[PDB]
PDB file of C-alpha atoms in Angstrom:
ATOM      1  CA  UNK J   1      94.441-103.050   8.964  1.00  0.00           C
ATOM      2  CA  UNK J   2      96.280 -99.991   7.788  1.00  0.00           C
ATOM      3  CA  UNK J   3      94.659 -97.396   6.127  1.00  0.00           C
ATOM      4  CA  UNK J   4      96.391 -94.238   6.445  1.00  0.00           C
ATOM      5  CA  UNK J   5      95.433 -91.779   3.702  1.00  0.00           C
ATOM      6  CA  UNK J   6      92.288 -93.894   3.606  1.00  0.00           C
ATOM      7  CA  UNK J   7      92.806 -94.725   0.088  1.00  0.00           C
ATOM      8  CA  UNK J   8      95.255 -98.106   0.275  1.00  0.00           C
ATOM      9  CA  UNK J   9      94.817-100.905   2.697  1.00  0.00           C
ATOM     10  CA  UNK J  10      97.522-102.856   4.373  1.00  0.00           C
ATOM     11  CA  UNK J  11      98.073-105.988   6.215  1.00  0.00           C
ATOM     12  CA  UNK J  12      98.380-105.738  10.177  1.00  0.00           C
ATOM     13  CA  UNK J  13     101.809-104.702  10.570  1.00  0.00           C
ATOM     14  CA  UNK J  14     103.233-102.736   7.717  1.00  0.00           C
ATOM     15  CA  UNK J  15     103.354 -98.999   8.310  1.00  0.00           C
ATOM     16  CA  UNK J  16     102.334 -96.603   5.238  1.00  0.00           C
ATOM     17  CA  UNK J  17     105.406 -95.772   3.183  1.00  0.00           C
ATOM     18  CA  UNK J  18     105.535 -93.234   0.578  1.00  0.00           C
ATOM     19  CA  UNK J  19     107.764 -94.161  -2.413  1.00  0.00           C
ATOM     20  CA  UNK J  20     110.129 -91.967  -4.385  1.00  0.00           C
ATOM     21  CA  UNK J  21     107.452 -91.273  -7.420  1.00  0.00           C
ATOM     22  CA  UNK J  22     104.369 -91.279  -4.482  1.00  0.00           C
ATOM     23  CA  UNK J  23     104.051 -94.958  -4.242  1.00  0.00           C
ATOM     24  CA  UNK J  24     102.180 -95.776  -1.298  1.00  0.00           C
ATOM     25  CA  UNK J  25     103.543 -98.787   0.247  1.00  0.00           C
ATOM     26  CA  UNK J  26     102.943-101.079   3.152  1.00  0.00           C
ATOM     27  CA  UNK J  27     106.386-101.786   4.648  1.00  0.00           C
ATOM     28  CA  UNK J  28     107.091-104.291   7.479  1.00  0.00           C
ATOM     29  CA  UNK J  29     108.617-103.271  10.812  1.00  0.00           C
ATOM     30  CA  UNK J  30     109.445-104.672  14.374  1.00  0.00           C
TER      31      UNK J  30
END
């Protein structure tokens, strides 16, 4: 999975995405 900062999980294949009010996001990519 993703972890990143090691504090929010994501499914295999998102990439960790930090939102305009630090959001952490898992957004999809190809």
């Amino acid at each position: 999975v993703i972890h990143c900062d090691a504090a929010t999980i994501c499914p295999d294949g998102t990439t960790c995405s930090l939102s305009p009010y630090g959001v952490w996001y898992c957004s999809p990519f190809s």
